[PDB]
């Protein structure tokens, strides 16, 4: 997160690591046994960390549990990133209170110009590099649509939304990828890809979750 603020330890409670020997992408936790990501942060031998706030350092709230499958969606696109969406179960149900919680499904698109809560632990520079090892947010709007195509002509499918701020210095990153966009206690995005971080006329663009309701459900139901 370029631009963004120290969330605070356990504040975002459904914020999850995905650690293969390092953090290397974010995820959210949407029930005791499943994390939505994104697709571009698909490998084998995950483990989930729950409870984080210092990613190198055990504070007493973590819970590490290593993944039993992983489903990356089934028309995902790694070239054009279209349907940037997986799932991952837990070998064992997190214990949840109020540092390890799920977070809401839509029940409802969100529109252009609601204000959204976006986190993770990735670079938090624009120019070169800095990986935070506390977790960082960033409140940003989502977009318009035409806002998002313009800034990303042939490239924004109905499956994608941006959110941010076109002036740049304020953004996801390398490293918050899978992460959440939490907009009034719903999960509505994942960070999904931009051109470089935070640069101008260059938003985040996001995974647009609601598009996908019915397909985690069904997927959760019979796995
Ligand atoms: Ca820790």
Same mark, same amino acid.
């Not at 984080?52 to 007493?60: A, M, P, S, T």
């Not at 990735?122 to 120019?127: L, R, Y």
């Given at each position: 997160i370029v631009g963004g603020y120290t969330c605070g330890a356990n504040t975002v409670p459904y914020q999850v690591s995905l650690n293969s020997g390092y953090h290397f992408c974010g995820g959210s936790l949407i029930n005791s046994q499943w994390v939505v990501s994104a697709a571009h942060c698909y490998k084998s031998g995950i483990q989930v960390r729950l409870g984080?706030?210092?990613?190198?350092?055990? &504070? *007493?709230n973590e819970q590490f549990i290593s993944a039993s499958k992983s489903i990356v969606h089934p028309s995902y696109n790694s070239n054009t990133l279209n349907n940037d969406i997986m799932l991952i179960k837990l070998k064992s149900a997190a214990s949840l209170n109020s540092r390890v919680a799920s977070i809401s499904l839509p029940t409802s698109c969100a529109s252009a110009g609601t204000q959204c809560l976006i986190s993770g632990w990735?670079?938090?520079?624009?120019?070169g590099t800095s990986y935070p090892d506390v977790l960082k947010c960033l409140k940003a709007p989502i977009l318009s649509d035409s806002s998002c195509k313009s800034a990303y002509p042939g490239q924004i499918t109905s499956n994608m939304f941006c959110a941010g701020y076109? &002036? *740049?210095?304020?953004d996801s990153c390398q490293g918050d990828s899978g992460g959440p966009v939490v907009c009034s206690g719903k999960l509505q995005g994942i960070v999904s890809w931009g051109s470089g971080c935070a640069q101008k006329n260059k938003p985040g663009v996001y995974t647009k979750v609601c598009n996908y309701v019915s397909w985690i459900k069904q997927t959760i139901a019979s796995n």
């Open positions: 984080e706030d210092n990613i190198n350092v055990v &504070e *007493g990735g670079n938090t520079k624009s120019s076109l &002036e *740049g210095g304020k």
